[PDB]
Design an enzyme around this catalytic site. Structure first.
Site, PDB file in Angstrom:
ATOM      1  N   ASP A   1       8.887 -12.387 -49.659  1.00 40.04           N
ATOM      2  CA  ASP A   1       9.923 -13.176 -50.327  1.00 40.04           C
ATOM      3  C   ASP A   1      11.312 -12.989 -49.732  1.00 40.04           C
ATOM      4  O   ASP A   1      12.302 -13.381 -50.364  1.00 40.04           O
ATOM      5  CB  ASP A   1       9.982 -12.903 -51.835  1.00 40.04           C
ATOM      6  CG  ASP A   1       8.963 -13.713 -52.614  1.00 40.04           C
ATOM      7  OD1 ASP A   1       8.432 -14.696 -52.054  1.00 40.04           O
ATOM      8  OD2 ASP A   1       8.704 -13.375 -53.789  1.00 40.04           O
TER       9      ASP A   1
ATOM     10  N   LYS B   1      10.856 -15.915 -45.082  1.00 41.89           N
ATOM     11  CA  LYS B   1      10.228 -16.288 -43.817  1.00 41.89           C
ATOM     12  C   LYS B   1       9.905 -17.778 -43.778  1.00 41.89           C
ATOM     13  O   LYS B   1      10.216 -18.469 -42.800  1.00 41.89           O
ATOM     14  CB  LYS B   1       8.966 -15.454 -43.594  1.00 41.89           C
ATOM     15  CG  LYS B   1       9.215 -13.955 -43.543  1.00 41.89           C
ATOM     16  CD  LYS B   1       7.915 -13.180 -43.388  1.00 41.89           C
ATOM     17  CE  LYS B   1       6.993 -13.386 -44.576  1.00 41.89           C
ATOM     18  NZ  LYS B   1       7.598 -12.869 -45.835  1.00 41.89           N
ATOM     19  N   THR B   2       9.282 -18.295 -44.838  1.00 40.88           N
ATOM     20  CA  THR B   2       8.900 -19.704 -44.857  1.00 40.88           C
ATOM     21  C   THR B   2      10.122 -20.610 -44.951  1.00 40.88           C
ATOM     22  O   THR B   2      10.189 -21.645 -44.276  1.00 40.88           O
ATOM     23  CB  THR B   2       7.944 -19.976 -46.017  1.00 40.88           C
ATOM     24  OG1 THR B   2       6.817 -19.098 -45.922  1.00 40.88           O
ATOM     25  CG2 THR B   2       7.457 -21.421 -45.985  1.00 40.88           C
TER      26      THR B   2
ATOM     27  N   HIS C   1       0.634 -11.053 -46.405  1.00 43.66           N
ATOM     28  CA  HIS C   1       0.774  -9.914 -45.502  1.00 43.66           C
ATOM     29  C   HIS C   1      -0.507  -9.667 -44.716  1.00 43.66           C
ATOM     30  O   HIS C   1      -0.457  -9.325 -43.529  1.00 43.66           O
ATOM     31  CB  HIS C   1       1.157  -8.660 -46.287  1.00 43.66           C
ATOM     32  CG  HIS C   1       1.027  -7.394 -45.497  1.00 43.66           C
ATOM     33  ND1 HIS C   1       1.889  -7.061 -44.475  1.00 43.66           N
ATOM     34  CD2 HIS C   1       0.126  -6.386 -45.574  1.00 43.66           C
ATOM     35  CE1 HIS C   1       1.528  -5.900 -43.958  1.00 43.66           C
ATOM     36  NE2 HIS C   1       0.462  -5.468 -44.607  1.00 43.66           N
TER      37      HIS C   1
HETATM   38  N1  GNP Z   1      19.811 -17.534 -52.224  1.00 42.35           N
HETATM   39  C1  GNP Z   1      18.868 -17.655 -51.279  1.00 42.35           C
HETATM   40  N2  GNP Z   1      17.587 -17.719 -51.627  1.00 42.35           N
HETATM   41  C2  GNP Z   1      16.776 -17.842 -50.547  1.00 42.35           C
HETATM   42  C3  GNP Z   1      17.132 -17.902 -49.218  1.00 42.35           C
HETATM   43  N3  GNP Z   1      16.011 -18.028 -48.408  1.00 42.35           N
HETATM   44  C4  GNP Z   1      15.013 -18.041 -49.244  1.00 42.35           C
HETATM   45  N4  GNP Z   1      15.401 -17.931 -50.557  1.00 42.35           N
HETATM   46  C5  GNP Z   1      14.522 -17.921 -51.718  1.00 42.35           C
HETATM   47  O1  GNP Z   1      13.749 -16.738 -51.690  1.00 42.35           O
HETATM   48  C6  GNP Z   1      12.409 -17.018 -52.180  1.00 42.35           C
HETATM   49  C7  GNP Z   1      11.378 -16.620 -51.132  1.00 42.35           C
HETATM   50  O2  GNP Z   1      11.327 -17.575 -50.076  1.00 42.35           O
HETATM   51  P1  GNP Z   1      10.145 -17.563 -49.030  1.00 42.35           P
HETATM   52  O3  GNP Z   1      10.604 -18.331 -47.851  1.00 42.35           O
HETATM   53  O4  GNP Z   1       8.941 -18.047 -49.742  1.00 42.35           O
HETATM   54  O5  GNP Z   1       9.964 -16.115 -48.597  1.00 42.35           O
HETATM   55  P2  GNP Z   1       8.718 -15.628 -47.869  1.00 42.35           P
HETATM   56  O6  GNP Z   1       9.092 -14.367 -47.195  1.00 42.35           O
HETATM   57  O7  GNP Z   1       8.212 -16.742 -47.037  1.00 42.35           O
HETATM   58  N5  GNP Z   1       7.664 -15.240 -48.985  1.00 42.35           N
HETATM   59  P3  GNP Z   1       6.195 -14.770 -48.632  1.00 42.35           P
HETATM   60  O8  GNP Z   1       6.332 -13.368 -48.087  1.00 42.35           O
HETATM   61  O9  GNP Z   1       5.435 -14.899 -49.930  1.00 42.35           O
HETATM   62  O10 GNP Z   1       5.549 -15.770 -47.704  1.00 42.35           O
HETATM   63  C8  GNP Z   1      12.401 -18.496 -52.563  1.00 42.35           C
HETATM   64  O11 GNP Z   1      12.704 -18.653 -53.941  1.00 42.35           O
HETATM   65  C9  GNP Z   1      13.514 -19.064 -51.688  1.00 42.35           C
HETATM   66  O12 GNP Z   1      14.089 -20.249 -52.203  1.00 42.35           O
HETATM   67  C10 GNP Z   1      18.498 -17.834 -48.862  1.00 42.35           C
HETATM   68  O13 GNP Z   1      18.989 -17.873 -47.726  1.00 42.35           O
HETATM   69  N6  GNP Z   1      19.318 -17.708 -49.981  1.00 42.35           N
HETATM   70 MG    MG Z   2       6.259 -17.392 -46.805  1.00 42.90          MG
END
Ligand code: GNP
Ligand code: MG
Length: 386
Positions: free
Chosen positions: A14, A17-18, A77
């Site tokens: 979270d 990355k996505t 992961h």
């Molecule tokens: N405020 C803020 N929130 C962010 C930012 N980037 C991502 N988020 C939020 O953080 C959360 C996780 O995003 P995500 O891209 O899914 O992270 P991830 O690492 O891909 N998750 P995973 O490890 O499950 O695949 C989401 O609610 C997203 O909107 C950012 O730059 N600022």
């Molecule tokens: Mg992701």
């Protein structure tokens, strides 16, 4: 057309990355041209099968002015563990996403550790979620922690590019934050060197079959994985038994007689002074003095879960399976890490292997772990020992 570079986003759960992957494709599409990808499309990764090993991976593509990028992003992961160990998604460089709100976390360390173990050459850091943190001193403290964590695993932390950005704000179209995405893509272009193409590496051909042809002589067949073999050049036959030197007296594809065999081609190589009985399964042809045979190596392995068609039973220190290198199985014994006595299906560990026959290897060689011809694990050679 344009140089092709393979990258991907790594980092703790979270940390974004996505969201970063979507932001990269979207910002580059509106700036340089291309097709944008939405978050939901990248998050909903398809399932792929490399060799009995199930991995969920999203593949996006984007272009800088001078390069074309293939980018992998995974929803779990375990998907990153499988990808880095099997090399199903090879990486010339990785983007480490660290959320400024949290700093480095347990999976930040673990992904850096896997990166060094499987040979990820370069890492760029995207300090994400800076829209949430306005404190300049706190951001500096986090960068120092990231740099020391990278250096702990032999990456150049002091010279590592770190971009302070917000993937979410950039994806939402904030121009001030989109500029940081362009700064990140600039580091992809400038910090990751153009990868060495296979045809420029030392010649290597894994032997897949062998035939006695007309007028004595021996032909070995296979795909040229690296380099070029030219008629008249000498080759070494490495693996299984004592290394032998030979000369290439011919290369042919089907009915075509060629003066050379290039990387990516399926060829037959004529060998002088070698009889068919001197060729063993698992041997390779190589440019002399470029690869060595080894029996003992340190590796990172992934054990298939029961649901993945792996074994149902855990194994212990006496586990004596087959290690499939390129073309054939070789039985080996294992040593488990200190404090580990049982390995469950679905686990990944460091494993020291001792083969009963040497195999031509160097760091990065992938292999499968098999029992009775069925894949139960996959590994990568992390450090040769013998
Ligand atoms: N405020 C803020 N929130 C962010 C930012 N980037 C991502 N988020 C939020 O953080 C959360 C996780 O995003 P995500 O891209 O899914 O992270 P991830 O690492 O891909 N998750 P995973 O490890 O499950 O695949 C989401 O609610 C997203 O909107 C950012 O730059 N600022
Ligand atoms: Mg992701």
């Amino acid at each position: 057309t344009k140089p092709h570079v393979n990258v991907g986003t790594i980092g703790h759960v979270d940390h974004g990355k996505t969201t970063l992957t979507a932001a990269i494709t979207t910002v580059l599409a509106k700036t340089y041209g291309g097709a944008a990808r939405a978050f939901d499309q990248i998050d909903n990764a398809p399932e792929e099968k490399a060799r009995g090993i199930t991995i969920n991976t999203s593949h996006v593509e984007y272009d800088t002015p001078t390069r074309h990028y293939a980018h992998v992003d995974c929803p779990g992961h375990a998907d990153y563990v499988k990808n880095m160990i099997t090399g199903a998604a090879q990486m010339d460089g990785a983007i480490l996403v660290v959320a400024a709100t949290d700093g480095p976390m347990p999976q930040t360390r673990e992904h850096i550790l896997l990166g060094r173990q499987v040979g990820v050459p370069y890492i760029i850091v995207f300090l994400n979620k800076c829209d949430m943190v306005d404190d300049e001193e706190l951001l500096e403290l986090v960068e120092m922690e990231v740099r020391e964590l990278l250096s702990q695993y032999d990456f150049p932390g002091d010279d590592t590019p770190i971009v302070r950005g917000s993937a979410l704000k950039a994806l939402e179209g904030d121009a001030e934050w989109e500029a940081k995405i362009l700064e990140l893509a600039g580091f992809l272009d400038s910090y990751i060197p153009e990868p060495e193409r296979a045809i420029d590496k030392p010649f290597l051909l894994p032997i897949e079959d062998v035939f006695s042809i007309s007028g004595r002589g021996t032909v070995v067949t296979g795909r040229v994985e690296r380099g070029i073999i030219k008629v008249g050049e000498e080759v070494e036959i490495v693996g299984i038994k004592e290394t032998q030197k030979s000369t290439c007296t011919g290369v042919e594809m089907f009915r075509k007689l060629l003066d050379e065999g290039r990387a990516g081609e399926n060829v037959g190589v004529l060998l002088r002074g070698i009889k068919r009985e001197e060729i063993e399964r698992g041997q390779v042809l190589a440019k002399p003095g470029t690869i060595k045979p080894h029996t003992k190596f340190e590796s990172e392995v992934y054990i298939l879960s029961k649901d993945e068609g792996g074994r149902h039973t855990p194994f212990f220190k006496g586990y004596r399976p087959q290690f499939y290198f390129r073309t054939t199985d070789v039985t080996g014994t294992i040593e488990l890490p200190e404090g580990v006595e049982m390995v469950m299906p679905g686990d990944n560990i460091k494993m020291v292997v001792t083969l009963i026959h040497p195999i031509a290897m160097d760091d990065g060689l992938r292999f499968a772990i098999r029992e009775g011809g069925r894949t139960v694990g996959a590994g990568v050679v992390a450090k040769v020992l013998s």
